[PDB]
Assembly symmetry: C2
Homo-oligomer: 666 residues x 2
Amino acid sequence: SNAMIRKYRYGAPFDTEALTEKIETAEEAFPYGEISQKEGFAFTYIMDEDDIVYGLGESNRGINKRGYCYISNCTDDPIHTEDKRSLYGAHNFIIVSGKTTFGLFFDYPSKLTFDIGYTRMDTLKVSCENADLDIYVIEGENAYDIVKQFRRVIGRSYIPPKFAFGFGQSRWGYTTKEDFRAVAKGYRENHIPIDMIYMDIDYMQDFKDFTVNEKNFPDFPEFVKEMKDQELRLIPIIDAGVKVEKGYEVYEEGVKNNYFCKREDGSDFVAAVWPGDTHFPDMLNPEARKWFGDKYRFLIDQGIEGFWNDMNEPAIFYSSEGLAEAKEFAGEFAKDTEGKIHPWAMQAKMKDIVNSPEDYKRFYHNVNGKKIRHDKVHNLFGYNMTRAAGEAFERIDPEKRFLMFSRSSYIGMHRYGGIWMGANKSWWSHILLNLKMLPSLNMCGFMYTGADLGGFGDDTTRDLLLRFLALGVFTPLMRDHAAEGTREQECYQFENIEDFRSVINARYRLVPYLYSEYMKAALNDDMYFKPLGFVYPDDKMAIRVEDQLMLGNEIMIAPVYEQNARGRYVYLPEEMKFIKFMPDGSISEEVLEKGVHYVDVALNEVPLFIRSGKCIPVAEAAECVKDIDTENMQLIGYEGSSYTLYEDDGIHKDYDKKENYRVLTK
Amino acid sequence: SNAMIRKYRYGAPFDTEALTEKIETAEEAFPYGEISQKEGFAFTYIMDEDDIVYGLGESNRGINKRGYCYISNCTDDPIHTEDKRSLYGAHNFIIVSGKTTFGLFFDYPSKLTFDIGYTRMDTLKVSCENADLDIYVIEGENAYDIVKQFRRVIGRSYIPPKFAFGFGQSRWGYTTKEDFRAVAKGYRENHIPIDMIYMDIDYMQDFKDFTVNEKNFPDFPEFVKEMKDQELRLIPIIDAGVKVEKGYEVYEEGVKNNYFCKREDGSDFVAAVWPGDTHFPDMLNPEARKWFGDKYRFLIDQGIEGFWNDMNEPAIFYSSEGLAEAKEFAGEFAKDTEGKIHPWAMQAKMKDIVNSPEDYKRFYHNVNGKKIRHDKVHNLFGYNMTRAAGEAFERIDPEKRFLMFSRSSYIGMHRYGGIWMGANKSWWSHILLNLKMLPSLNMCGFMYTGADLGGFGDDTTRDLLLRFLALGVFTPLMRDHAAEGTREQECYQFENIEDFRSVINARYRLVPYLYSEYMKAALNDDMYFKPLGFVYPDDKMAIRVEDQLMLGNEIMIAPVYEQNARGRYVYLPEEMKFIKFMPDGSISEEVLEKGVHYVDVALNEVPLFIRSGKCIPVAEAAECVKDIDTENMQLIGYEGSSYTLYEDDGIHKDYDKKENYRVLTK
């Protein structure tokens, strides 16, 4: 089809500000399927048997979304299993790809249900409670063309500083300078590369946003510099909830200036999170956003160059109302002698007060003099928290890139920060799940992304971490961050440390190439990771591959994701050079023809494939991003090919200089 | 190595009667690794890097058990996640396979921990609280030889009646005659093959074992006949817990004759399950065992020819003690004004009263006057419940085979019934899990096995059901039994029901072959399913394949287990004929050479591979086992090959007759 984007408006949509490009309202009949405004809103479309459905960004299941139900409803779940319908992100863009091909973006800020062949195999049904939304229809040559059009109108993706393409580490539990010093020493003295150490909630004073524990960090700026002098940048977490505490300045200011979300009666809503009772900044109120974002100056002025935003669905352990209800019910259960209240009913009530739909109807946002109940705009919360930070960085230092990523998100947030897929338990299934999400995230603007393995208890075995890190080599966010209750030993503490050094070395050897492809893609509103079907649209086998990805225009990745495996099957849609980074520092190469192959990949080997007629630069291993030698890089791949390398200072925003680009020829 | 079996005795083991062959106590030092009795019992062994560890029957993870922790401790968990350490069965047989190869059976009836490279990759450690156990060491030239020796000493596996090789259907909520009549009608009017309909707990009078609801089934024997006249055999469930109810004969007899498990003070221990308060029959008390098993006559005399035993870990929703503790805790939570008792602690207490280790220490078995605390022999409960039934069948009708399978088990129970792998979710990952478990189950004597999907609502999508059934085609227990909180998932309830009919037709066409292989294996203490490494021991690639299985000596299976997939990769260790049962009743054939292939398999096609120089008989599709025409079967496979068909009357036990064997030549 001829490229076209049209916007169909229903009712009176809340302005989410997802798009940067203004699309005029289309007046003509809606061009695909059927629209009903009877029971709220529903779009219904009958798919052809061969149709593939792409999109939904951070959502469960596979690259082809057919065959299940997905609900856009920012949610933090304890475990990511196959039946979960909602993850942390609400990314309402889908592309139907087949004989009839088109994209749809449903710009709607509340619970949106995508029944993608779940109820009836041939039926796509997208529904929500109120017909107040904009639907963008995108037409084009194919799915990839449709994605590129969408990427244009949602505005340029967030771009991290180059140090963020290094490796990072963190543990929920690091509290003192001494803990951080031991990690720094463990990596540097064992020559494992690293650029970042993440600080979890224990660095704060009693879990208070925009404080540092003064007992532990009396001289925090000096410690920040101590780490930075060793090319270790500390990246502190910020939470959505601001502790209720008299005399705490962030709390006092929020109360005085009405910057917190309020109950129906205008009192400040209380949600318990890590600090106990908290209030939530009204992320949808521009004045509150400016105030909250400006608080980041507290840490930036101490030498911090990156942040991560958490618990921003927002998470609620319980509300004052929910806790009271639960205690009342517990009292009834305690006194019940007639078998009225079953133990499982008691258990359910306790589970029900966590992230409760009832609580999301108990507080409001103040948006242009109007109070809007939170549930009606729930999916915008994390988005606007991260927007608050991003906009504050632009005011503080317009020309500087800060590392920034968020748990919850909605399209539009992709301009301000990346995302990470969190986890609690260490599962093999996490590897494939995260691989599959990558292209979908890219379709929706989120290019700086990565995942956590889990880390709880002793469940992270050596081989699981090694395979997880070998996927991480390619994801812009690559870190080993372990969750609460972790007893995960450090990379330098596992048996045969050289294997970990090998995998992380591979990341650093690839940084110039990966950074270059990230920059070329971000600056041109293109994808960093692509499904095979976007690159080989005429190959019926290629279009259905879900456990391999194309990266940039030069390579294909295919990580091993099965325990005890010494290799895996791949499909090559053209001739490629199969490359492995070896634990002795060498790079092995084998030419493989188009077709099916089984390739050997040891735990301490990192594989990739270089496409026919392409090459990539590979640096010698270095232990931090600053020390990578990009003057003397070898070119791996096909004789006679060339590669355009993007390289800037990695710090500022001087993107449009011709000097940033140089052609390398093998 | 030269075949041999030695028994090493530690302490004063409880006699589990797992082995039928008596082995003398060896007096030499333990032949492999090291044994410690410093703190309970521990066996520690250093594995070679290439060693594969087989075994553990019904356990999590893969065929090669290396890289995780497994605890033998019969348990019913709400969700079978990849991190779970214990399933329903405790099958303490492992084989280390490599440069040095040997098998070990740990005959110990309590919590047994297998740390198989979980803590340290090269270390196998098996441990338990008390050094009172027998350890059998089995030597042989290879893992398969070692398995065959083990199968000899544990005694011949349970053999089902031939009707049990048909297809079965059930739903938790079937309650009335009309419920069952609708199933009979739906299947038979649509020419969908079927032999069995399962009866879940609603057929009883108020969940009372060995009753039938007389309002719903006024003349049950007449109804059983109504069904049997249409070749539908009703298969009723029996639970471990006998309802506490005055006037209920099973309860009154148990109380009067001290046939229930008692608390320390001699009172009958109370456990809540489906009927509310129940007592558990004392399965280790020989008189109580005989009494409980004899109760099956109630149903046998009414025309019932099969049973399934459930909740027999035994499951406990709560005990009287646990409930009282939970209520006390709840009272404290309710009155807490200082926030000392957190809601998650309340939630945890509620969770903790279900299947509680503390409850398993509260009741005892009386074995000839010797009182044994249940936890010390926990893994023997389900085994002995099923033994009770099996021994009663032998007294009631020695010449007749009954269908019998059980949820919980221990080696030794394999002589008396099969097992099924239940579930509370409908996950694609459970297809692969169940596939991988099959050979391990066969190693431990359990050949009559199969699995369920158990998701709620409409979470079992049409395509998942079809792929699940396509694995089921090959598993001796093949049924579609759906949970309570679920849509109706009968094969005649989906859009294009021909697809379901096609898959079940494939089963029936294969019944003569599958039954023949089952009988030959059972009668010769051999495996029905085998890992590829057992058949192609010299092929380094074959030995590590985990998502294909060999069946008998003729075929290989390789089910598709990925959503939206139209085919899958396979490795063929020799030339084979790739065949597919097609929806039009045809059978496609293609010769494929040794090596790697991607094969196309549609949702409504059932694939298998016939080995070079082999053939199998394939019958025309029939709608019940009785109607299968075995006189005029096709031979599919290689010209010049032969197949020996075992066929008997399928009802009695006349196995040792030359006339049971017929040689077919293609």
